[PDB]
Ligand binder design. Sequence first.
Ligand SMILES: [Mg+2]
Ligand SMILES: [Mg+2]
Ligand SMILES: [Mg+2]
Ligand SMILES: [Mg+2]
Ligand SMILES: [Mg+2]
Ligand SMILES: [Mg+2]
Ligand SMILES: [Mg+2]
Ligand SMILES: [Mg+2]
Ligand SMILES: [Mg+2]
Ligand SMILES: [Mg+2]
Ligand SMILES: [Mg+2]
Ligand SMILES: [Mg+2]
Ligand SMILES: [Mg+2]
Ligand SMILES: [Mg+2]
Ligand SMILES: [Mg+2]
Ligand SMILES: [Mg+2]
Ligand SMILES: [Mg+2]
Ligand SMILES: [Mg+2]
Ligand SMILES: [Mg+2]
Ligand SMILES: [Mg+2]
Ligand SMILES: [Mg+2]
Ligand SMILES: [Mg+2]
Ligand SMILES: [Mg+2]
Ligand SMILES: [Mg+2]
Ligand SMILES: [Mg+2]
Ligand SMILES: [Mg+2]
Ligand SMILES: [Mg+2]
Lengths: 109, 48
Amino acid sequence: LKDVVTREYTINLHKRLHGVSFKKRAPRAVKEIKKFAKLHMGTDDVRLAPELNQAIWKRGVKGVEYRLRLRISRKRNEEEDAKNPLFSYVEPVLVASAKGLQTVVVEED
Amino acid sequence: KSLYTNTSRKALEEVSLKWIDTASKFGKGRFQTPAEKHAFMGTLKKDL
RNA sequence: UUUGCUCCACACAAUAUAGAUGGAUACGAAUAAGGCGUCCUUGUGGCGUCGCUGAACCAUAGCAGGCUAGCAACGGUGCACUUGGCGGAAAGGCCUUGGGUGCUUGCUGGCGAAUUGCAAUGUCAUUUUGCGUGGGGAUAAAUCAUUUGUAUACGACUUAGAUGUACAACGGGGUAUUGUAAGCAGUAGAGUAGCCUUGUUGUUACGAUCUGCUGAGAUUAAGCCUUUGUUGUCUGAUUUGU
RNA sequence: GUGAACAGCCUCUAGUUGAUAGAAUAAUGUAGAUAAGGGAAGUCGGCAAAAUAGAUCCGUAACUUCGGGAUAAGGAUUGGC
Ligand SMILES: [Mg+2]
Ligand SMILES: [Mg+2]
Ligand SMILES: [Mg+2]
Ligand SMILES: [Mg+2]
Ligand SMILES: [Mg+2]
Ligand SMILES: [Mg+2]
Ligand SMILES: [Mg+2]
Ligand SMILES: [Mg+2]
Ligand SMILES: [Mg+2]
Ligand SMILES: [Mg+2]
Ligand SMILES: [Mg+2]
Ligand SMILES: [Mg+2]
Ligand SMILES: [Mg+2]
Ligand SMILES: [Mg+2]
Ligand SMILES: [Mg+2]
Ligand SMILES: [Mg+2]
Ligand SMILES: [Mg+2]
Ligand SMILES: [Mg+2]
Ligand SMILES: [Mg+2]
Ligand SMILES: [Mg+2]
Ligand SMILES: [Mg+2]
Ligand SMILES: [Mg+2]
Ligand SMILES: [Mg+2]
Ligand SMILES: [Mg+2]
Ligand SMILES: [Mg+2]
Ligand SMILES: [Mg+2]
Ligand SMILES: [Mg+2]
């Protein structure tokens, strides 16, 4: 089966952009983060929040923060069934430092 | 095992080690045992 | 994946074949020496014989080999069985025991054959491969993809994945690098300028820097080591048979 | 703004973000860097590279057509408050 969830993940961007060409580091984060929403909950179709985009590009092509705390909701597809029936929406959770947080199930209401 | 009986002298030398470097290799290791690190640096901000 | 698959029998339709047509018949060794037989003192021994080629030995008669009746042997031989053994150089073969069964040209009889017409044209050998039956049998894997990085231009290589002593994502701990974070505090600080009750420590502003909390904080696998924590994941694709 | 500055670097107004794209990071490359000790032994030849460099103060040879040579050479200094 496939059930709607929404958890809060902290991603280690640093070890994934380690070595990446500066002009390519922010764009790797968008790609690498998509790859991350697919790992947890093999959703395949991934959409990012434009607040997440800002959040990623927050310091230029070159300076992606080492860790990002992410919110990832697996949801139901609407309109002419684009292959799979489920998204992952991804968005930034406000928090001082993204260090030391574990992964957490967000109870939906 | 050797395919031959070497009498190299270099090959008959019985060896007995005096010490075995046991420091970290992941960096410029200073100490051999966690014990020794403590004794040398004293009590840190963690600990106790 | 729906068909299947495997061994043995005998049964058809193909298909191929460096070339069946009585038998590939097992010492070793020397050659100015030997084989065989025989005896022995088992030896560089004694006696006898042989070669001068396989122009041998063995087998061979029966409608491409039929049907039929007997004697004499107790043998020969083919087949399917069976008792022992031996053979690893590629042994996949060899000897041996016990019956059973067909044939026996060792010998003596009774039949058959034509007209395929005076030669053409005639015995069918063994490979594979597909189908058929009746029986016995056995009931997996490789690739794509995903993943590791002891590997790598791409292919290739090496790992991992079905409920685990699993795997991943995070968190923790250890390891390392740098050199003491932000914030707060100081009768620390060259001094200058304000204002007051004008100083047994007078306050207020401005002030690099200094000191304390602070070997602190930040980073640490991305090809570091590790884990009683948290959360998640765990049957998509394709291909293969003697 | 820095600064001697219409330099270089950063910005405002205005204008672009347009030059096929994705995945990897073998060799050999093109362009950019760095090397222990030695220091031209390389090479036709220091080619290429490296080193020097602003400013203030001090200092300054042969020769000379007396104008030069001359930023000769050689030195000290430079932030913040
Ligand atoms: Mg690199
Ligand atoms: Mg940028
Ligand atoms: Mg090392
Ligand atoms: Mg003789
Ligand atoms: Mg004799
Ligand atoms: Mg003969
Ligand atoms: Mg006939
Ligand atoms: Mg052979
Ligand atoms: Mg003829
Ligand atoms: Mg490697
Ligand atoms: Mg484990
Ligand atoms: Mg996971
Ligand atoms: Mg300190
Ligand atoms: Mg454990
Ligand atoms: Mg679990
Ligand atoms: Mg102008
Ligand atoms: Mg420019
Ligand atoms: Mg225009
Ligand atoms: Mg072009
Ligand atoms: Mg050098
Ligand atoms: Mg020198
Ligand atoms: Mg030379
Ligand atoms: Mg030369
Ligand atoms: Mg020279
Ligand atoms: Mg030059
Ligand atoms: Mg240098
Ligand atoms: Mg000074």
